[PDB]
């Protein structure tokens, strides 16, 4: 048996308060983790071999 | 960074919600005591000759 997994981390969620408000806080951290918080372009056309 | 500060302030006011109150119901209660002896107040008076 083999499997593939996405590892985006663990994010604690507190019950009894708004979920969307907590999601916004975690959204910035997720954007920072993926490197998409600041304006950017992708240079991946040179990452190849033959 | 500006969005992080805005989202943080909003979450702070959302967390300012009360859950419950806890207290003690003790007014009206008093501590009992125990009396070990019945307070009888009887004496026996008899004459010298017992008549």
TrEMBL record, chain B:
<protein>
    <submittedName>
        <fullName>Vp2</fullName>
    </submittedName>
</protein>
